Amino acid sequence: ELGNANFENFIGATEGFSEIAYQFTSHILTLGYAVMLAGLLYFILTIKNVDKKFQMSNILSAVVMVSAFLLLYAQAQNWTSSFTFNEEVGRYFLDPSGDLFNNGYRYLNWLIDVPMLLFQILFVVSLTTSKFSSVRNQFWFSGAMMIITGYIGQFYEVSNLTAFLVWGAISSAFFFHILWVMKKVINEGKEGISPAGQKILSNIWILFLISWTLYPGAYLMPYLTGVDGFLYSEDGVMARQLVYTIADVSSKVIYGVLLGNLAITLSKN
Amino acid sequence: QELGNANFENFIGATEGFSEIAYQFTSHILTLGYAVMLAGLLYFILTIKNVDKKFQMSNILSAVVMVSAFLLLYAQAQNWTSSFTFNEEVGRYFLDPSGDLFNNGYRYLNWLIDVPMLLFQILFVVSLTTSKFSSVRNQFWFSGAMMIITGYIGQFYEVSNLTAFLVWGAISSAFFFHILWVMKKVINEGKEGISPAGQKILSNIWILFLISWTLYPGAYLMPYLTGVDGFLYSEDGVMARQLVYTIADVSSKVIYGVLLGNLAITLS
Amino acid sequence: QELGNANFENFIGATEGFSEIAYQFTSHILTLGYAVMLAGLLYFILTIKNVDKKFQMSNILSAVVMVSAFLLLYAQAQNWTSSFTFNEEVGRYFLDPSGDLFNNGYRYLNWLIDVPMLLFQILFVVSLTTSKFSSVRNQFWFSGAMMIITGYIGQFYEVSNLTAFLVWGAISSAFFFHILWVMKKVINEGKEGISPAGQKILSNIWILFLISWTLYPGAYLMPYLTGVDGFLYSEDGVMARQLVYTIADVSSKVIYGVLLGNLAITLS
Amino acid sequence: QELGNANFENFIGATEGFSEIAYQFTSHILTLGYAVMLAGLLYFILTIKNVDKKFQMSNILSAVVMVSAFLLLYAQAQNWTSSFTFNEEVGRYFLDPSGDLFNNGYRYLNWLIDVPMLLFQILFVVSLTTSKFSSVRNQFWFSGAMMIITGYIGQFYEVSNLTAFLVWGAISSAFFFHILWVMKKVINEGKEGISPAGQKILSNIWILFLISWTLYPGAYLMPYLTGVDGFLYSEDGVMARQLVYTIADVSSKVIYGVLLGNLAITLSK
Amino acid sequence: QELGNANFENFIGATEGFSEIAYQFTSHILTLGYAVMLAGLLYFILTIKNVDKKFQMSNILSAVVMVSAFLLLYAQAQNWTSSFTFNEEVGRYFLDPSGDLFNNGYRYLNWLIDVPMLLFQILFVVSLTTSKFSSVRNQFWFSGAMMIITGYIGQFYEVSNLTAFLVWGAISSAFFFHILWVMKKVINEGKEGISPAGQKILSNIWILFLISWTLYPGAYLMPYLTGVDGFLYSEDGVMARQLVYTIADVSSKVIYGVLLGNLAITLSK
Ligand SMILES: *C/C=C(C)/C=C/C=C(C)/C=C/C1=C(C)CCCC1(C)C
Ligand SMILES: *C/C=C(C)/C=C/C=C(C)/C=C/C1=C(C)CCCC1(C)C
Ligand SMILES: *C/C=C(C)/C=C/C=C(C)/C=C/C1=C(C)CCCC1(C)C
Ligand SMILES: *C/C=C(C)/C=C/C=C(C)/C=C/C1=C(C)CCCC1(C)C
Ligand SMILES: *C/C=C(C)/C=C/C=C(C)/C=C/C1=C(C)CCCC1(C)C
Ligand SMILES: CCCCCCCCCCCCCCCCCCCC
Ligand SMILES: CCCCCCCCCCCCCCCCCCCC
Ligand code: NA
Ligand code: NA
Ligand code: NA
Ligand code: NA
Ligand code: NA
């Protein structure tokens, strides 16, 4: 009996994980947190490369880096502690002494990441029709609602599929609102800047859309091939954590780097 | 099973145990706490040069509080996860004494850093008018120390001796009310003779201070806010206590420091 | 149960065990200690540029002492929590030999950083008149080293051999008195030719130094301050010893450095 | 006992076990590795201001690589010490599955940081002539990623499936050769129009790059460099592999960065 | 039972075990060591700007050495405490093989950082007269590497094979004497043409170097300095060895760097 636990624990407790699955998941989480610490150093060391008015972006990027490093390190340790090798069959099985594995660790830490990532672009682009404070408030409210509803949802991904899907849809509504507001922000930011900055802003928009869409994908991952599908397996576990790592790097580090490049081009010198 | 003067989390964990949701949520919220504290440390260090020299002591004290809070919340998260272990037969997390009993006192003693400094730093932004700096500082520090120490004594008896728990809590509340009085005076005097933007920021600071600080005795009382054998005397109350702690920590420390920095900026 | 030349904390833990309150309080006070030390490190680094170049060596040495103290107190907190484990049947923490016996000697050898540097750093703020810098430094360093090493040898015998314990303590006390004399001379000469505010700060520094440094032999003698089989030869004495250690640490290091910084500011 | 797709260190440790010398030396060499990486981090940060502004990006990228390498090598040292435990009866260290299986893949995924950045940073010191910056960078990044991913897949089968091991290794070697080609081009173009001292520094950089990077497929092949049941299919091969890894890491990262810094100094004014 | 090529600390711990005083003292001295190293790191960073630009590299190298030493000593402290565990029945700490055997080799490989850098950094303060910079550097580095490697091989056999122990020690001692010769020359040339205060500082540095560096072969020989079954082949010898290591480390690294900084100050304007 596992109750309201993530599906990684069910797979680990019934079939277990092959060497490749367990080792790969550990490797990808380690890569994640190492990327976050390296990004922290990068964003600190390049602060003085942009005009004063843009440096708040670098600062917020560093804040996000700290959050992500700490969380991903904890999550890597959680993964390696929750599953242990069984010599008889050569697979890693659920070790309850390590606690059940739970992805929710990320969700609450998104309560840092999402507000800040949405916030920092407002320190680079200049709005035209929209009010700064109103856009910020909309970002923050919709982000909080999205994160909390998805957090509740993911606890039931095995024990109660209906709650899982309903909470996911409720979260998706706020997600769509966030996408709308960000589209407005980028469009207004394009107005009245050099074509190079406009190209950077278009790249930022594409990056934002794809990387942020990856997260509900990881949310749904075990069921993307339906019940007892190919992905309801260790393959799905690997896929979920890989998608998480790609999304983390893209939405945080590369996003911050593109914002820094935009700040450089908009800066005098 | 004999637990003595232990927090009610240990009694819940030893009798009913914790569901996956309760245990995991508590771990998540404590992790969020310490991550917020370290991020705030970085923010306050990186923004020091944004204010006039005379105001930078506030940034420095914010960073000090951030260091204290990060260390404490990290240790407390590890304590939580070490004290409770999964029982596979029933699927619940039960008290694991090899990890030591869980105790909230870790927070309390670290408040001996946070409370004096948080109360101190506001005096580096506002200018007093009728009140003396040294007098306000000494009152803040004495009353904070007494509040913290009495509440610390109280919380050990929250299960073993409800009477001592409540008496120590009331004694602490007296010093708390004194602190609220002194802070109200400080905010009012700080409003005198400053720009309207600063006055709006100071009003916001007062409201934030009042609510966030009042949350702490709420967490203190949490297991009994629905009476004996109430709805909250359960894993729900454990979750609520740690949630309220995290909200109060973030609001009273990080947001407080940020608003103080904004006030310093407007006054520069 | 054979413990040999071990500190009395282990004997209390192996015979009576520790109640929840005693164990938890000791953990809390050691954690508070190391958190205070890290916060002090941050403060002293961030305030370096607040004083003239000639005084900044004091800030730097304060930071060095902070590093030493943080590392040592963190290690000691981990040692405390590893050495004693909960017994479910009776609800007390007993000696867990897999965690090693508890020993305060960790502090003593780390004083070989703290004591030379603390005594040294004051020579970068005050100006001597009749005394020679090098002579004062050398006397400070020799007497500190001898005091620390002899007390270190002594504390291993606080239970196994009371005679060696007391004899080594007295030998240490002689060098302690020599240090007190030299520090009195230094402070008196430092008062000569500076403003009255600096003189008041120096008087405060002297009082702080005397009390905080006297606290250490108090912790040394703590288990026997009520004689054999006294009230303090118990978990109460363990709590008192670590509490006195923490108060002395904070006072002699952080507050001492802060007062020195204020003196440097007034002299700048 | 069944180990599946595991590195040969696990098979040696589970069958013969490790003598004191082999186990201790491997631990020492991994510890030395991560210590060198953190020291290099400090050096590259402290010497940033020794070069003109335009060259400081090289210092920054060196520091990023140092962070990656430190984190990875520390984790790997802990993994080594966790996977093998002393057996009192015979005096050898045997596989301790409770510590998890030992796997070199930790280094491969972190190369996804190291290789792109190491190749990138030289473009902030040398000036290209006929080649385009973006094209060289894109080729570097794509070929490095493919090399790393194919070798990572390969190394899981070094015992369980020699054929897949060798096929994936060859595919990786192709991208390696492409990288060597592009780097030779970069060095040649960089030599044009700089002082003879800088040209000598660039020649040294080329030799260092070639040797240090070639050491890595050597470590890949190590257990079989003396054939089946050869001298190296033993604890000697395990220690030799980790030794080659550490030499290659230090040379390809720290000494590479130091030579680039010296080149930047000579080019500065 | 069978310990093989292990350090004598493990033999003492496995046969007689360690009393409370011996075990606790060794742990305390290792902790003191690494604390001193981290404090020195902070000191050397914070005082960089106290000397003229051309001398600041010395500060940097001191910081580099501090990092290495810190990491190594930290690891060694934990290693000590993991290798020996209290036996309740008799009240002594005995070898706990689950923690791994204790090995001093951790120090030796980290000297491959410490020894070259310590020898290198003095060349950034003193001016040579008859000797060539590159020649002195090359000789220092080669002879240091050989000394370290030969001593490292030797120390594994200090119990299992006394003959190899002494032969490798003597081979190391030859390179040690060469290093002493070259350093004496360097000090003599550095004294020429500087103020007498600087000359006195250099004399003090020479004395410090000679004594502190000679302490290391003393620790090498420690268990046998009173012959077979001597007073020092005991827990007293273990304590003495680690104490000598700590004194030598502090003197040869921290105090050495401080004296070099003082020399740089006196030569500065
Ligand atoms: C650094 C983290 C970032 C940018 C996180 C972004 C999160 C999302 C886009 C969340 C999406 C969710 C839904 C739209 C539906 C299901 C639940 C979520 C929380 C996964
Ligand atoms: C960052 C931490 C802060 C601001 C802590 C503030 C602490 C309090 C407001 C303490 C309150 C207490 C009482 C008023 C009554 C019951 C006991 C306490 C200690 C929880
Ligand atoms: C930060 C640490 C400081 C200032 C330590 C000071 C140490 C002492 C005052 C030592 C005192 C001792 C004696 C005078 C007698 C008994 C033994 C000692 C070592 C505790
Ligand atoms: C700091 C790390 C660096 C520069 C790593 C470089 C990695 C390689 C040159 C990898 C090479 C490989 C092949 C050419 C063949 C076999 C598989 C690899 C991945 C080991
Ligand atoms: C910080 C560490 C330093 C300066 C290390 C210095 C090392 C030595 C002087 C090495 C000495 C050795 C011999 C001369 C003979 C026996 C073997 C050694 C390796 C201990
Ligand atoms: C110049 C600085 C002046 C600082 C004055 C502030 C004083 C704060 C220290 C208060 C210490 C209170 C002591 C509490 C004793 C605890 C008794 C507990 C009773 C059970
Ligand atoms: C220029 C600096 C001159 C240094 C002055 C003296 C300060 C160093 C004193 C070192 C004291 C070491 C005492 C240890 C002796 C061993 C103790 C054995 C038991 C008594
Ligand atoms: Na595991
Ligand atoms: Na747990
Ligand atoms: Na414990
Ligand atoms: Na091991
Ligand atoms: Na131990």
Side-chain angles (χ1 to χ4, degrees), chain A residues 2-183 185-198 200-267, chain B residues 1-53 55-87 89-131 133-184 186-199 201-228 230-268, chain C residues 1-52 54-131 133-184 186-199 201-228 230-268, chain D residues 1-48 50-53 55-184 186-199 201-228 230-268, chain E residues 2-131 133-199 201-228 230-268:
Chain A
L2 298 184
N4 303 318
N6 290 174
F7 93 107
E8 292 86 349
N9 302 290
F10 289 85
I11 303 306
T14 61
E15 312 150 354
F17 300 116
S18 71
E19 177 70 359
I20 287 176
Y22 175 81
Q23 290 288 359
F24 171 76
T25 304
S26 181
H27 301 162
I28 201 60
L29 289 174
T30 300
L31 172 58
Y33 76 65
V35 165
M36 298 307 164
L37 197 61
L40 174 54
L41 193 49
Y42 175 84
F43 288 124
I44 292 173
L45 286 178
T46 57
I47 286 178
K48 304 273 197 175
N49 285 351
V50 301
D51 289 353
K52 192 75 212 215
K53 60 175 301 195
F54 300 126
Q55 285 180 9
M56 189 58 58
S57 169
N58 278 76
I59 294 171
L60 293 181
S61 280
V63 159
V64 174
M65 293 301 102
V66 167
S67 165
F69 166 71
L70 284 178
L71 202 284
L72 292 184
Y73 188 84
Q75 198 70 313
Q77 311 323 312
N78 289 342
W79 177 255
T80 56
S81 77
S82 287
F83 305 101
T84 63
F85 196 70
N86 184 289
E87 301 190 54
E88 271 83 17
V89 305
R91 297 174 73 78
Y92 297 82
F93 288 93
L94 180 59
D95 186 352
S97 75
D99 298 347
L100 304 198
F101 186 79
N102 194 269
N103 293 294
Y105 277 96
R106 310 181 156 251
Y107 283 64
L108 287 208
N109 266 60
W110 291 340
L111 259 172
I112 300 172
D113 303 356
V114 162
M116 292 304 99
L117 286 168
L118 294 175
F119 194 31
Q120 69 178 127
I121 189 159
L122 298 184
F123 289 98
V124 182
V125 304
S126 302
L127 299 177
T128 59
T129 321
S130 301
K131 250 213 296 184
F132 175 97
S133 67
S134 176
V135 172
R136 179 205 64 207
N137 288 354
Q138 286 176 63
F139 273 157
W140 285 2
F141 176 76
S142 280
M145 293 302 102
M146 181 184 67
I147 292 162
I148 295 172
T149 56
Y151 178 66
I152 295 165
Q154 58 85 32
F155 279 115
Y156 299 107
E157 67 178 31
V158 175
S159 60
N160 190 338
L161 196 65
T162 300
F164 175 68
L165 292 182
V166 170
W167 286 113
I170 294 174
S171 182
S172 296
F174 290 105
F175 178 48
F176 289 142
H177 182 227
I178 292 167
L179 289 184
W180 185 266
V181 174
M182 179 56 81
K183 188 46 175 162
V185 166
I186 295 203
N187 286 339
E188 298 188 24
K190 284 175 163 186
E191 288 169 27
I193 76 170
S194 77
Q198 295 181 329
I200 293 174
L201 275 172
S202 37
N203 285 337
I204 288 171
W205 171 243
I206 301 304
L207 180 68
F208 182 86
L209 186 61
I210 295 174
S211 68
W212 281 55
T213 300
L214 284 183
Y215 286 98
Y219 184 87
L220 290 178
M221 186 59 68
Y223 298 120
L224 282 183
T225 48
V227 164
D228 295 343
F230 169 81
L231 285 179
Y232 200 81
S233 70
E234 68 173 17
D235 300 297
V237 171
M238 295 170 70
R240 175 178 260 181
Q241 298 307 311
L242 171 58
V243 165
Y244 273 140
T245 300
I246 293 169
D248 288 336
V249 171
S250 299
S251 69
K252 305 180 207 284
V253 177
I254 301 182
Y255 179 78
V257 170
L258 289 191
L259 275 182
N261 289 354
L262 179 56
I264 290 176
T265 73
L266 296 180
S267 285
Chain B
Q1 187 179 8
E2 191 51 45
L3 296 186
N5 302 315
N7 290 172
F8 95 107
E9 290 85 350
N10 301 288
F11 289 85
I12 304 306
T15 61
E16 323 192 345
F18 299 115
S19 72
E20 178 70 1
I21 289 177
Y23 176 79
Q24 292 287 359
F25 171 76
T26 306
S27 182
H28 300 163
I29 200 60
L30 291 178
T31 300
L32 173 56
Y34 75 64
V36 167
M37 299 307 159
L38 197 61
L41 174 54
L42 196 47
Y43 176 85
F44 288 123
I45 291 173
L46 287 177
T47 56
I48 283 180
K49 290 196 172 267
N50 288 351
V51 302
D52 287 355
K53 188 63 186 300
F55 300 128
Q56 287 179 9
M57 187 58 60
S58 190
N59 277 75
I60 292 170
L61 292 183
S62 281
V64 159
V65 171
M66 293 302 101
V67 169
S68 166
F70 166 71
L71 284 179
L72 201 283
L73 294 183
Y74 188 86
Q76 198 69 314
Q78 262 45 237
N79 290 340
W80 176 256
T81 55
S82 77
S83 287
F84 305 102
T85 299
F86 198 72
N87 184 288
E89 273 83 17
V90 313
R92 295 173 76 78
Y93 297 81
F94 287 96
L95 181 61
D96 184 356
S98 74
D100 299 347
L101 303 201
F102 186 80
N103 195 267
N104 291 294
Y106 276 96
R107 288 182 181 273
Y108 283 65
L109 290 208
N110 272 227
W111 292 340
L112 286 174
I113 299 173
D114 302 355
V115 162
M117 293 302 100
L118 287 168
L119 294 175
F120 194 32
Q121 70 176 126
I122 191 159
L123 299 186
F124 287 91
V125 183
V126 304
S127 297
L128 297 178
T129 58
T130 44
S131 306
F133 173 88
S134 65
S135 172
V136 170
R137 179 202 61 206
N138 286 355
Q139 287 178 68
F140 272 155
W141 286 2
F142 177 76
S143 281
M146 294 304 297
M147 180 183 66
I148 292 161
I149 293 173
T150 57
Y152 180 65
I153 295 164
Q155 58 85 33
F156 278 116
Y157 300 106
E158 69 181 31
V159 175
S160 60
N161 191 339
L162 195 61
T163 299
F165 175 70
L166 292 180
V167 169
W168 286 114
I171 294 171
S172 181
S173 295
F175 289 105
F176 176 49
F177 290 142
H178 182 223
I179 291 165
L180 288 183
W181 180 261
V182 174
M183 179 58 93
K184 191 45 163 151
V186 168
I187 300 267
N188 287 339
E189 298 188 23
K191 284 203 203 186
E192 283 168 86
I194 77 167
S195 74
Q199 292 185 332
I201 294 172
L202 274 174
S203 293
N204 287 337
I205 286 172
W206 169 245
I207 302 303
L208 181 67
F209 179 92
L210 184 61
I211 298 175
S212 68
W213 282 56
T214 300
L215 284 184
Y216 287 101
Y220 185 87
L221 289 179
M222 186 58 68
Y224 299 119
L225 283 182
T226 49
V228 166
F231 170 79
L232 286 181
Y233 201 78
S234 69
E235 67 178 24
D236 299 295
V238 170
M239 294 169 72
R241 176 178 262 177
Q242 296 308 312
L243 171 57
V244 165
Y245 273 139
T246 302
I247 294 167
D249 286 335
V250 171
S251 298
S252 68
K253 305 180 208 284
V254 178
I255 302 182
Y256 179 77
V258 167
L259 290 195
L260 276 183
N262 289 354
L263 178 55
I265 288 177
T266 73
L267 296 181
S268 285
Chain C
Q1 266 269 33
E2 190 54 59
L3 295 189
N5 304 314
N7 290 172
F8 93 106
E9 292 84 348
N10 302 289
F11 290 86
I12 303 304
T15 61
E16 323 191 347
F18 298 114
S19 71
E20 175 71 1
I21 290 183
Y23 177 80
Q24 293 287 2
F25 172 76
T26 304
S27 318
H28 301 163
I29 199 58
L30 289 175
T31 301
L32 175 55
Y34 77 65
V36 167
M37 298 308 162
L38 197 60
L41 175 54
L42 193 49
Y43 175 85
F44 288 123
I45 293 173
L46 284 177
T47 55
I48 285 179
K49 291 267 218 220
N50 287 352
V51 303
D52 289 353
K54 54 179 292 182
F55 300 127
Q56 287 179 8
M57 187 58 59
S58 190
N59 279 76
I60 295 169
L61 292 184
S62 281
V64 158
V65 172
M66 292 302 101
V67 167
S68 165
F70 168 72
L71 285 177
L72 199 284
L73 292 184
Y74 189 85
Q76 198 69 314
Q78 312 319 312
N79 288 340
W80 177 255
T81 54
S82 76
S83 288
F84 304 101
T85 298
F86 197 72
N87 184 288
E88 302 190 22
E89 272 81 20
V90 309
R92 297 173 76 79
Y93 298 82
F94 288 89
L95 180 60
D96 184 356
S98 76
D100 296 350
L101 303 199
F102 187 79
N103 193 268
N104 292 294
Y106 278 98
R107 287 180 179 273
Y108 284 63
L109 289 208
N110 263 60
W111 293 340
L112 286 172
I113 299 171
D114 303 354
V115 163
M117 292 303 99
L118 287 169
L119 294 176
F120 194 30
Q121 72 175 127
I122 192 159
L123 297 185
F124 287 91
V125 181
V126 305
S127 296
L128 300 177
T129 57
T130 43
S131 304
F133 175 94
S134 65
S135 176
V136 172
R137 179 204 62 206
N138 288 356
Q139 286 176 69
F140 272 156
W141 285 1
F142 176 75
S143 281
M146 294 302 298
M147 180 184 67
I148 292 161
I149 293 171
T150 56
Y152 179 65
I153 294 164
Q155 57 85 33
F156 279 118
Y157 299 105
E158 69 180 31
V159 175
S160 60
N161 190 207
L162 193 63
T163 299
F165 175 70
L166 293 181
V167 171
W168 287 114
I171 294 171
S172 182
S173 295
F175 289 104
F176 179 48
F177 291 142
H178 182 226
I179 291 168
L180 290 182
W181 186 264
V182 174
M183 180 56 85
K184 190 46 176 162
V186 168
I187 296 200
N188 285 337
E189 298 187 25
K191 285 176 164 188
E192 288 165 25
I194 77 170
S195 76
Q199 292 182 343
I201 294 167
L202 275 173
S203 292
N204 287 337
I205 286 173
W206 170 244
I207 301 304
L208 181 67
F209 182 94
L210 184 59
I211 297 177
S212 68
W213 281 54
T214 299
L215 286 185
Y216 287 102
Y220 184 88
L221 289 178
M222 183 60 67
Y224 298 122
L225 283 182
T226 48
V228 303
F231 169 81
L232 287 180
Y233 201 79
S234 69
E235 66 175 17
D236 301 297
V238 169
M239 294 171 72
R241 174 178 262 178
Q242 295 308 312
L243 172 55
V244 165
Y245 274 140
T246 302
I247 293 168
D249 290 338
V250 171
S251 298
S252 68
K253 304 180 208 285
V254 175
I255 300 181
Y256 177 78
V258 170
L259 290 190
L260 275 181
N262 289 355
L263 178 58
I265 289 176
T266 73
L267 296 180
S268 286
Chain D
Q1 39 172 339
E2 257 288 290
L3 298 185
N5 303 316
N7 291 174
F8 95 107
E9 289 86 350
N10 301 289
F11 288 86
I12 303 306
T15 60
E16 313 149 43
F18 298 114
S19 71
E20 179 70 1
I21 288 101
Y23 176 81
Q24 292 287 2
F25 172 76
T26 304
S27 181
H28 300 162
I29 202 58
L30 290 175
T31 300
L32 174 56
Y34 76 65
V36 168
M37 300 307 162
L38 197 60
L41 175 53
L42 196 52
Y43 174 84
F44 288 124
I45 293 172
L46 287 177
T47 54
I48 285 179
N50 284 350
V51 302
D52 291 354
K53 197 77 210 311
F55 299 125
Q56 287 179 10
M57 186 59 58
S58 188
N59 277 77
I60 296 170
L61 293 183
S62 281
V64 160
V65 171
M66 292 301 101
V67 168
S68 166
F70 166 71
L71 286 177
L72 201 283
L73 293 183
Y74 190 90
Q76 197 70 313
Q78 311 318 123
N79 289 341
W80 176 255
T81 55
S82 297
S83 286
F84 305 101
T85 299
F86 197 69
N87 184 288
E88 304 191 325
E89 329 295 12
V90 305
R92 297 174 75 77
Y93 298 81
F94 288 89
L95 182 59
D96 186 353
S98 73
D100 295 348
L101 278 206
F102 188 79
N103 195 269
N104 292 292
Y106 276 97
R107 309 181 147 262
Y108 285 64
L109 289 208
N110 264 61
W111 291 340
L112 285 175
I113 298 168
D114 304 356
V115 161
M117 291 306 100
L118 287 167
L119 293 175
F120 196 31
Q121 71 175 126
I122 190 160
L123 297 185
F124 291 90
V125 182
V126 305
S127 299
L128 299 178
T129 57
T130 44
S131 303
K132 279 170 285 196
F133 175 96
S134 70
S135 173
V136 171
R137 178 204 62 209
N138 290 355
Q139 287 177 68
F140 271 155
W141 286 2
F142 178 75
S143 281
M146 295 305 300
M147 179 185 69
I148 292 162
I149 293 172
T150 57
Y152 180 64
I153 294 164
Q155 58 85 34
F156 279 117
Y157 298 105
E158 67 181 29
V159 174
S160 60
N161 192 336
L162 196 61
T163 300
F165 177 69
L166 293 179
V167 169
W168 287 111
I171 293 171
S172 182
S173 295
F175 292 105
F176 177 49
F177 291 140
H178 184 227
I179 292 168
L180 290 184
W181 186 267
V182 174
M183 180 55 83
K184 191 43 178 164
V186 169
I187 300 276
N188 287 338
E189 298 191 22
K191 282 180 171 186
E192 287 168 27
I194 75 171
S195 74
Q199 295 183 344
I201 295 174
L202 274 174
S203 290
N204 287 337
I205 287 171
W206 171 245
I207 298 128
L208 181 66
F209 182 94
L210 188 59
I211 297 175
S212 67
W213 281 56
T214 300
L215 285 183
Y216 287 99
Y220 184 88
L221 289 179
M222 185 59 68
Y224 298 119
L225 284 182
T226 48
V228 83
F231 169 81
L232 286 179
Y233 200 80
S234 68
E235 67 176 15
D236 299 297
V238 169
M239 53 197 291
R241 176 179 258 179
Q242 297 308 312
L243 173 56
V244 166
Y245 272 139
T246 301
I247 292 168
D249 286 334
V250 170
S251 298
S252 68
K253 303 180 206 288
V254 176
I255 301 185
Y256 176 76
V258 170
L259 288 193
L260 277 182
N262 287 356
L263 179 57
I265 288 176
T266 74
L267 296 180
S268 285
Chain E
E2 251 312 294
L3 297 185
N5 304 121
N7 290 173
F8 95 107
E9 290 85 348
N10 301 289
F11 290 86
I12 302 306
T15 60
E16 313 150 324
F18 301 116
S19 70
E20 178 71 1
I21 286 177
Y23 177 80
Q24 292 286 1
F25 170 77
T26 305
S27 186
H28 300 162
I29 202 59
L30 290 176
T31 301
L32 174 56
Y34 77 65
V36 166
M37 298 306 161
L38 197 61
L41 175 54
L42 195 50
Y43 175 85
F44 289 123
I45 293 172
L46 287 178
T47 56
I48 285 179
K49 287 178 119 69
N50 287 351
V51 302
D52 289 354
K53 191 68 207 305
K54 59 170 164 184
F55 299 125
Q56 287 179 7
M57 187 59 57
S58 190
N59 279 76
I60 295 172
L61 291 183
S62 281
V64 159
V65 174
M66 293 301 101
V67 168
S68 165
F70 165 72
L71 285 177
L72 202 284
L73 291 184
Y74 188 84
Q76 274 290 74
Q78 314 318 131
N79 290 342
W80 179 256
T81 55
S82 77
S83 288
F84 305 100
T85 297
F86 196 71
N87 185 287
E88 302 168 53
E89 324 290 354
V90 306
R92 280 174 88 78
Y93 297 82
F94 287 89
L95 179 61
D96 186 355
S98 76
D100 296 349
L101 271 40
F102 187 80
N103 194 269
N104 292 293
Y106 277 99
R107 287 179 181 274
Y108 285 64
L109 288 208
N110 262 61
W111 291 339
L112 287 173
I113 298 171
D114 303 357
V115 162
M117 292 304 98
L118 287 168
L119 294 175
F120 197 33
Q121 70 175 126
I122 190 161
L123 298 186
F124 288 92
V125 183
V126 304
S127 297
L128 298 181
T129 58
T130 44
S131 305
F133 177 95
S134 67
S135 295
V136 169
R137 179 203 62 208
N138 289 355
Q139 285 176 69
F140 273 156
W141 285 1
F142 177 75
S143 281
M146 291 302 157
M147 182 184 66
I148 292 160
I149 291 173
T150 56
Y152 181 65
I153 294 162
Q155 57 86 33
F156 278 117
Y157 299 106
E158 68 179 24
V159 175
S160 61
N161 192 338
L162 202 161
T163 297
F165 174 69
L166 292 182
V167 169
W168 288 113
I171 294 172
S172 181
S173 295
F175 292 105
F176 177 51
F177 290 142
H178 181 220
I179 291 168
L180 290 184
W181 185 267
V182 176
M183 178 56 82
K184 187 45 178 162
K185 279 209 311 170
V186 167
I187 299 276
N188 287 337
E189 298 186 26
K191 285 178 171 187
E192 286 167 26
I194 76 170
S195 77
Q199 296 180 28
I201 295 169
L202 275 171
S203 293
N204 290 337
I205 287 170
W206 168 242
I207 299 303
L208 181 67
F209 180 86
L210 185 61
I211 298 176
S212 67
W213 280 55
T214 298
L215 285 185
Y216 288 100
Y220 186 86
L221 287 177
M222 186 58 68
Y224 297 122
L225 284 183
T226 48
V228 61
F231 168 82
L232 288 180
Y233 200 80
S234 70
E235 68 176 16
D236 299 296
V238 171
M239 293 170 72
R241 176 179 261 179
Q242 299 310 313
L243 174 56
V244 166
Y245 273 139
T246 302
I247 293 168
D249 288 335
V250 171
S251 299
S252 68
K253 304 181 208 285
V254 178
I255 300 180
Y256 177 78
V258 171
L259 287 191
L260 277 183
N262 286 356
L263 178 57
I265 290 175
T266 72
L267 294 179
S268 286

